[PDB]
């Protein structure tokens, strides 16, 4: 049920290590959870995991150098433009601001949330909490190695330089 | 005695497929043969395979968007500059010019060459003849899969973006 969500989190993590040499952030993973709940909500800002959930490996062609994804067809925007009433992941534009708080949602608590709010907070260490949930259920190391090979196959279709461009 | 040369050819083929979505050309492979025979000769032009022979995996940090390598320390130049008396792979500068001829050297014959004409020629399908030799010695697929893992590992250190710069 959460298969599509957890896969997007592992795959986006692997691609970011290839692209920027580090893995996805607490809030980048949070954006995947938001995209999972609200399929037509625009995600603005640190939105890389949400991009993999909505676009799959095709997200690779729309990543900015910042690691933010621009693909309007999937309602993903690196910065806030006029009229996009979306969630701003770690930023102050859009209709809803999403940031980190002591008493913000844990991954499980966020999936049960039944409504959107003008401001949204996720707990600290959201990434660490979310990975532990996935590690229980899957052999994450085997999944990462498959993801790496599949991402590398994608990049090598037309090459690093064409894919960036 | 030829393992480092054949390895450089397979690794550079795999890296070029990641960088530009295609394999190495007949004369890019020939440039490694030349680097192998003449360790101090500057190599100008289509020179990627020579770069891996001389720099190993460090060649990935010095590739131009043309797939030509710039590393003065390793006598590798993408274009001919004043006083660089080197072999020009597929170009007309330097002191020696290397191109394809219907009568040009085969890989075995080139390895047996004992001096340096003002105009060297390699035969057509030099890449095919070279790949056909290497494939009689190793399971090339095992090499490619290792080269991929190690190239990707190198790229992911600082990420694709920092590497091509």
Numbering used by the authors:
A (entry chain A), B (entry chain B): 1 to 165
Q: Any passages from the paper?
A:
To this end, we determined the crystal structure of SegC at 2.8 Å resolution. In addition, the electrostatic surface potential on one side of SegC reveals two positively-charged grooves, which might play a key role in the DNA-binding ability of SegC. All four monomers exhibit an almost identical conformation, with the root mean square deviation (r.m.s.d.) ranging from 0.20 to 0.25 Å (in Cα). To determine the most likely interaction interface that could represent a major structural element in tetramer formation, we used the PISA server to measure the surface areas of these two dimer interfaces. The buried surfaces within dimer AB and dimer AB' are 713.4 and 497.4 Å2, respectively (Interface-1 and Interface-2 of Figure 2D, respectively). Therefore, Interface-1 of dimer AB most likely plays a major role in the formation of the SegC dimer, and the interaction between the two dimers contributes to the assembly and stabilization of the entire tetramer. The major residues that contribute to Interface-I are Ile160 and Leu161 from the C-terminal α8 helix of SegC. Furthermore, interactions in the SegC AB' dimer interface (Interface-2) are primarily attributable to loop-rich regions, comprising the α4β2, β2β3 and β3β4 loops of both monomers. We also noticed that two SegC tetramers can assemble into an octamer from two adjacent asymmetric units.
This study delved into the unknown function of SegC (SSO0033), a novel protein thought to be involved in chromosome segregation in archaea. The segC (sso0033) gene encodes a 165-residue hypothetical protein of unknown function. SegC has a tertiary structure folding similar to those of the ThDP-binding fold superfamily, but SegC shares only 5–15% sequence identity with those proteins. Surprisingly, we found that SSO0033 exhibits nucleotide triphosphatase (NTPase) activity and assembles into filaments in the presence of nucleoside triphosphates (NTPs) and DNA.
